[PDB]
Design an enzyme around this catalytic site. Structure first.
Site, PDB file in Angstrom:
ATOM      1  N   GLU A  99      10.481  -5.288  17.375  1.00 11.95           N
ATOM      2  CA  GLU A  99      11.257  -6.332  18.027  1.00 11.95           C
ATOM      3  C   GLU A  99      10.505  -7.618  17.830  1.00 11.95           C
ATOM      4  OE1 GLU A  99      11.968  -3.919  22.156  1.00 11.95           O
ATOM      5  OE2 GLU A  99      11.724  -6.067  22.334  1.00 11.95           O
ATOM      6  N   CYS A 152      10.531 -13.224  25.864  1.00  8.37           N
ATOM      7  CA  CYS A 152      10.941 -12.952  24.447  1.00  8.37           C
ATOM      8  C   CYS A 152      12.224 -13.707  24.084  1.00  8.37           C
ATOM      9  CB  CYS A 152      11.161 -11.434  24.205  1.00  8.37           C
ATOM     10  SG  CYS A 152       9.703 -10.403  23.927  1.00  8.37           S
ATOM     11  N   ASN A 201       0.785  -1.258   0.000  1.00 10.28           N
ATOM     12  CA  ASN A 201       0.000   0.000   0.000  1.00 10.28           C
ATOM     13  C   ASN A 201       0.804   1.289   0.000  1.00 10.28           C
ATOM     14  OD1 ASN A 201      -2.103  -1.676   0.036  1.00 10.28           O
ATOM     15  ND2 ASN A 201      -2.722  -1.309   2.164  1.00 10.28           N
TER      16      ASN A 201
END
Lengths: 536, 536
Positions: free
Chosen positions: B294, B328, B281
């Protein structure tokens, strides 16, 4: 080997020499002009330190202001030339990255001093001859700006290295500013020898290796910049210069999985194409390639009724007509209060009519010619549309002739309606009391606005401009022309753009690093159980 | 109105409360646990300050460690909900951007103090209940890390504002750190309430407005974080919370030409899809959208023969099994010298066998359950492949049962060969004298390596690791687990990634600004002629 926390020398802007009639730099400059003009050279690729012509098409590089006079000849890089350049870069990486920062930094500090002294007029003259710059336009670019990039980037890099974290009790935290993992591809434009030299060297400084594809018409100065860097001690293969149009280079480089980044300055079309190609090939790359650069824009100036006429006139002349309107940001559009126009309109037209464009080896000329045929053809086109357009009158200039050089006269257009690179200035005279409405119009019409200026003694007027046009342009000037020295006018970029990381701040250099944290804990836990776990 | 150059308060890391048995915070925490658990709520969208359920599918949010116990119910955002959120953001922009920096900054400083005192156990408990965190995992995340983001970002922002240029004789140069032109879209993951709150607030701080799509399973804490911000004075519409899976939100937001940026943390798949859609887009956007974030990685630990056994054992347990391996960056792979394994292998297996996972409202448990069914199913899968694989033995754990909660036992695997989120640790025992070869293997196998550690008392060993693995991981730890506090362990990212600009340094905040230069010249030229032009 060393036990030290060292400091780099403190940078300051290199003074601009004037090359006035009695001056010794003027003498030295003449020697260099003749020597480059009288002795055209081969302009080869520089790969792994080897200077070599290649097998592609031979292309002459000429004086734009006198296109029958050749300056050198280069070869259009082939796929094999490009591949060799990539391998030379990958191959020099390990020794370059392992040099301590101070030693890498010395290369660019030394280059800067060589440029400031013994190489000064040689590099200025090559910029004058091949890019059609007056000696002034050359001194501020090929000399001072390039020197300032090198000395300030060394200092910015050093400042970066000392940005370090907090260490709590029991631990030591440190940050390591690593170079990137593959090679960086630098692609440089015609109009600034400083940019051309900075794009491949800034990432080099941080421990990276590079292929550099300069613009054809800037290649004489680019090749001498390469030699200069060699003389400063740049090891072979750290930067690798490939000449030509770049098509076969991009073919190779954007297909290599080791491409780590692209450092680009030029047209938005070219940038967009690069951006698409990298996107298409994104699955092949070991690292996410970092695309860093800058494109053009056109600049507005608004004069308020409180503007100084002599200041405005001068700002418009220099702003529109320095380097034949070919700076990354030349004044194209001016919006002038009616009563200021009554006081300075005729003088503006009169001085533009008298402004001397010609052969830049004649130092009395204000400027030179356009860079090449394409540019000449775009300007002829723009002048003929302006003649055909109802909205616009040619008030002065509009003449052109490519028989000696690519010459287009300084041209001023009057447009009634307030809605390429070349010496064209469009002037719209607006009624004094409609200042703020003109600020809205500008704001509303401001997609590819790179810089803006207001000319106004009135403080309320200045502040209203700073305000209303806050988001209409990335660099804004007050009571001067909107056209930037290292350390002083950083950042900017066009409206909507993501270019805080462009050449001229520490931010650019960070883009050529991948920082890691390192934490050492001295006495870490020997039981995994946590306090909340105790009974009860 | 003011005449001042102000300073912000100086930040320092918020102390971590222990919630030990006699402690008053433990009492307060119990009150909050009951109150949230006993009284489930609607979890609405917060748009333009209006709290409203929408018409999309209703989705329960439950305790992962006890999935029959509901915590609230949200509605899946529709296209209309998303559009309203975009408009509320665009509509609050002008008043938010016009607040002076100090007033915007006070909102987040106040939020931080509210979180540190009266809201502390309320937000920790919501993080415990909905995300299945022990009170420790909750305190370091939902409390301390979020507080530290807010207080340090206020300080980083202030430091940024004073980065200013040199002014030469005759001029004044200044830099203005403008917010961006449209709205920022923040998309936050399940595993950290700090990240969830930081992603939309960091850009807000700089003068931007935001839509925030939190993860379904984190939505209880996200909704209370929204209320907290409201109580701190965040004006309506500056951040707008839309619940659900995000599909209808992205449909609307990535199609809006006013999209200025995306602030994302989650899986690489999701990031890649966002990145493609924006690329597709790209022609519709007023500004080039900035994609900042991240993704995950998995972490290695290497133990040298000189490693401390008790330190290594503890580092492995906590590193692999804190928050059920769902940080994470959890330790997945350990490489241990044979003689260190002889000294601590059995104890490691023994402690992992005894490690208590259960209902986190029982504070004696080490940890809780996996976040949801998908996660549970991925872990069962990984355990059954490990059972089937020749290369790998289940040494301890491997059990699972989703009948009460999504529980998977701490599992240790022995792999002979050195070549999702969950409590799984793979251990490879290598002969002491092959240290350096193990460093090569790791380096060679290191595509999505986010962090690394070395455990070693021997200084030569440590330095060899720091060296050889320099480019194998973005964060490197010595004699501790490789799992980061604000101000102390910034940067990092996975190998090949472009993430120096992630949450936790000033670099992130710069991404939410567009700096402009402003130059005023006091006495500009009134003649356009240059010195080199004089005769002769």
């Amino acid at each position: 080997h060393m036990d030290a926390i060292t400091q780099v020398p403190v940078p300051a802007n290199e003074p601009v020499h004037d090359y006035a009639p009695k001056s010794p730099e003027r003498t030295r400059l003449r020697t260099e002009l003749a020597s480059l003009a009288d002795h055209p050279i081969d302009l080869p690729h520089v790969i792994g330190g080897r200077h070599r012509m290649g097998d592609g098409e031979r292309i002459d590089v000429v004086q734009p202001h006198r296109h029958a006079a050749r300056l050198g000849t280069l070869t259009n890089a082939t796929h094999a030339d490009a591949a060799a350049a990539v391998e030379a870069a990958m191959s020099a990486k390990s020794d370059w990255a392992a040099l301590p920062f101070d030693e890498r930094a010395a290369v660019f500090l030394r280059a800067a001093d060589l440029l400031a002294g013994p190489w000064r007029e040689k590099i200025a003259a090559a910029t004058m001859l091949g890019q059609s710059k007056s000696v002034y336009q050359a001194e501020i670019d090929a000399v001072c700006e390039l020197i300032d990039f090198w000395r300030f980037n060394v200092a910015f890099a050093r400042q970066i290295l000392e940005q370090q974290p907090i260490s709590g009790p029991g631990e030591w935290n440190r940050i390591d500013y690593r170079p990137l993992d593959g090679f960086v591809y630098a692609i440089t434009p015609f109009n600034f020898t400083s940019i051309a030299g900075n794009l491949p060297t800034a990432p080099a400084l941080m421990g990276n290796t590079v292929i550099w594809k300069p613009s054809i018409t800037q290649t004489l100065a680019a090749y001498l910049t390469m030699q200069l860097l060699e003389a400063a001690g740049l090891p072979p293969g750290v930067i690798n210069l490939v000449t030509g149009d770049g098509f076969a280079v991009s073919d190779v480089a954007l297909a290599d999985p080791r491409l780590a980044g692209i450092h680009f300055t030029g047209s938005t079309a070219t940038f967009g194409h690069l951006w698409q190609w990298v996107g298409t090939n994104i699955g092949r790359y070991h690292s996410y390639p970092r695309l860093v650069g800058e494109t053009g824009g056109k600049d507005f100036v608004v004069a308020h009724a409180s503007a100084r006429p002599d200041v405005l006139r001068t700002a418009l002349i220099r702003g529109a007509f320095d380097y034949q309107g070919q700076k990354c940001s030349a004044v194209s559009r001016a919006f002038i209060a009616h009563s200021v126009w009554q006081r300075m309109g005729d003088e503006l037209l009169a001085k533009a009519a008298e402004l001397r464009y010609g052969d830049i080896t004649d130092l009395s000329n204000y400027g030179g010619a356009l860079i090449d045929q394409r540019a000449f053809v775009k300007n002829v086109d723009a002048i003929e549309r302006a003649k055909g357009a109802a909205a616009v009158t040619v008030a002065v200039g509009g003449e052109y002739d490519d028989s000696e050089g690519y010459f287009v006269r300084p041209t001023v257009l009057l447009s009634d309606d307030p809605t390429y690179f070349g010496p064209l200035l469009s002037v719209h005279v607006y009624p004094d009391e409609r200042y703020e409405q003109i600020l809205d119009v500008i704001d509303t019409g401001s997609r590819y606005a790179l810089t803006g200026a207001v000319i106004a003694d009135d403080r309320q007027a200045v502040l209203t401009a700073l305000d209303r046009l806050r988001f209409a342009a990335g660099n804004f000037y007050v009571n001067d022309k909107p056209t930037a020295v290292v350390g002083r006018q950083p950042f900017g970029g066009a409206r909507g753009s993501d270019t805080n990381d462009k050449a001229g701040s520490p931010l650019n250099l960070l883009r050529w690093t991948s920082a890691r944290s390192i934490k050492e804990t001295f006495v870490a836990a020997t039981d995994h159980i946590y306090p909340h776990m105790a009974v009860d």
